[PDB]
Amino acid sequence: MENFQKVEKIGEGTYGVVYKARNKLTGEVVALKKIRTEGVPSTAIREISLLKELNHPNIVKLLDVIHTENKLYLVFEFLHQDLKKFMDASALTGIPLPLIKSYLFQLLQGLAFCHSHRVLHRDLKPQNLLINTEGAIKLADFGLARAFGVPVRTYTHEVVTLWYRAPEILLGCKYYSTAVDIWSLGCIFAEMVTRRALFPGDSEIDQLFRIFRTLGTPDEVVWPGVTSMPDYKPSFPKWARQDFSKVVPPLDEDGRSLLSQMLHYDPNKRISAKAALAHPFFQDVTKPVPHLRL
Ligand SMILES: Nc1nc(Nc2ccc(S(N)(=O)=O)cc2)sc1C(=O)c1cccc([N+](=O)[O-])c1
């Protein structure tokens, strides 16, 4: 970029590439997302405007939006590490529970905020959760599928992670609800706790069946309407629900209770971000600072 000096490539998003860059003029360091194409939508460029006026301490700030040369650049505030790297770095010892709780609490605040402003993330995963030396964690790279929908992959032949995708999406639901983000966050919560992905599916069906084998194949009793969903098949195997205590050991009962509500099959029974913030699990929440190696 003529105005920006690419320090280095820091990620391959589901829409474009992300670079750490410095503003040649101001000298500020930012994250620059490059988007692919011969026109550019409108319902999207305006869905983006909404995201710019979306300011909250737990949401990565979208500084600028620049459309030029059949390219779409998104300028974001820069953070030094994502949760995927931090979990890997903490794989031997595990992230301490108070930090896990603080991170979950903050992300729920972020979600409560975007959801009350009718904004959905749609693609929450460790790679889209950024942390700093101050103990904060922020939601990054919002989906924006309401317009730009969901591309076959990311942008250039790349395996899109399905591990955090809600069951209703896998079953062909056309309209997503804020509940999809709660499910993804629940999956991440479990992963921080156990240090292993909850549902590591390698295909859409494998993803779906991994969920079924653990939470039990859903039926009309626990999920009214499930059998009438677009991709539901009566031929789905019928797995029994596994004891929840085997799921995220050795998480305490307050933690397991909160997770079970974040993982309810029925989107309408799934706990909201606002209600989750009030769960007894957060009675003793604090804000520890992580040990970050940058
Ligand atoms: N602002 C920002 N800072 C970042 N800093 C960063 C610093 C360190 C690491 S890492 N992996 O070395 O810990 C990763 C990101 S990433 C980032 C993003 O807004 C972003 C995140 C995921 C996907 C996309 N996207 O456009 O597709 C963009």
Side-chain angles (χ1 to χ4, degrees), residues 10 12-14 16 18 31 33 60 76-82 85 127-128 130 140-141:
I10 60 181
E12 310 179 308
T14 55
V18 209
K33 184 187 190 181
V60 173
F76 294 109
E77 64 169 301
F78 177 87
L79 276 86
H80 288 74
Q81 188 161 293
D82 64 41
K85 187 173 189 177
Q127 289 165 295
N128 297 340
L130 310 174
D141 197 40

Side-chain angles (χ1 to χ4, degrees), residues 160-163 165-167 169-172 199-214 217-218 230-237 239 265:
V160 53
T161 180
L162 305 164
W163 301 1
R165 194 171 292 182
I169 292 177
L170 296 175
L171 289 177
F199 304 125
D202 70 320
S203 71
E204 291 207 14
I205 201 59
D206 182 56
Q207 185 62 37
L208 189 63
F209 289 1
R210 268 172 188 284
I211 293 169
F212 293 0
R213 301 190 189 96
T214 298
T217 300
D231 301 313
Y232 173 83
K233 310 292 183 195
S235 51
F236 282 167
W239 284 285
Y265 270 120

Side-chain angles (χ1 to χ4, degrees), residues 42-51 122 143-148:
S42 69
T43 53
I45 62 182
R46 306 186 182 190
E47 202 179 314
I48 292 303
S49 294
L50 296 174
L51 291 184
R122 310 165 187 289
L144 190 88
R146 183 175 302 183
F148 244 120

Side-chain angles (χ1 to χ4, degrees), residues 27-273:
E28 77 167 304
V29 170
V30 303
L32 187 66
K33 184 187 190 181
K34 289 189 58 290
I35 298 293
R36 197 184 310 99
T37 298
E38 53 288 296
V40 174
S42 69
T43 53
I45 62 182
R46 306 186 182 190
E47 202 179 314
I48 292 303
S49 294
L50 296 174
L51 291 184
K52 282 205 65 180
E53 275 49 64
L54 201 62
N55 302 296
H56 179 96
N58 298 115
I59 297 177
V60 173
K61 188 181 179 182
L62 164 57
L63 310 175
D64 284 304
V65 182
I66 304 76
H67 176 188
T68 53
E69 271 44 53
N70 287 292
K71 299 286 183 63
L72 191 285
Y73 298 100
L74 298 181
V75 180
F76 294 109
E77 64 169 301
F78 177 87
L79 276 86
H80 288 74
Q81 188 161 293
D82 64 41
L83 191 62
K84 182 169 188 293
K85 187 173 189 177
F86 186 60
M87 290 193 284
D88 290 337
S90 307
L92 309 183
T93 171
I95 301 171
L97 185 64
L99 224 206
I100 291 180
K101 185 173 297 181
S102 170
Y103 279 173
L104 178 63
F105 188 65
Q106 287 180 64
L107 292 172
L108 283 172
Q109 290 177 60
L111 288 186
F113 185 79
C114 59
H115 290 169
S116 69
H117 284 275
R118 310 216 76 177
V119 173
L120 272 52
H121 184 99
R122 310 165 187 289
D123 191 35
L124 289 177
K125 51 193 173 182
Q127 289 165 295
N128 297 340
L129 301 180
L130 310 174
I131 59 175
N132 58 23
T133 56
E134 258 61 53
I137 181 164
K138 309 184 183 196
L139 298 157
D141 197 40
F142 279 68
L144 190 88
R146 183 175 302 183
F148 244 120
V150 55
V152 62
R153 287 296 186 64
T154 56
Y155 58 114
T156 54
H157 47 294
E158 288 170 52
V159 189
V160 53
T161 180
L162 305 164
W163 301 1
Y164 313 92
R165 194 171 292 182
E168 58 264 41
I169 292 177
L170 296 175
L171 289 177
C173 70
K174 305 179 189 63
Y175 309 101
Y176 295 4
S177 81
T178 57
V180 306
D181 294 331
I182 292 306
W183 172 282
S184 303
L185 188 54
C187 288
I188 294 168
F189 173 29
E191 193 174 337
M192 288 189 276
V193 173
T194 68
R195 297 137 69 167
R196 194 161 168 175
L198 223 206
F199 304 125
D202 70 320
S203 71
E204 291 207 14
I205 201 59
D206 182 56
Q207 185 62 37
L208 189 63
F209 289 1
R210 268 172 188 284
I211 293 169
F212 293 0
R213 301 190 189 96
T214 298
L215 304 175
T217 300
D219 53 30
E220 288 295 316
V221 178
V222 301
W223 189 352
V226 72
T227 65
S228 284
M229 297 190 77
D231 301 313
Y232 173 83
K233 310 292 183 195
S235 51
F236 282 167
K238 270 61 181 183
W239 284 285
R241 185 182 182 79
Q242 290 297 156
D243 186 319
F244 210 80
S245 64
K246 175 171 58 181
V247 182
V248 290
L251 190 63
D252 64 72
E253 193 63 39
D254 281 309
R256 288 183 299 198
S257 171
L258 171 55
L259 180 65
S260 66
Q261 297 196 114
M262 295 180 80
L263 296 180
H264 272 144
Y265 270 120
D266 191 343
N268 297 111
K269 290 193 187 71
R270 204 170 303 154
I271 194 164
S272 66

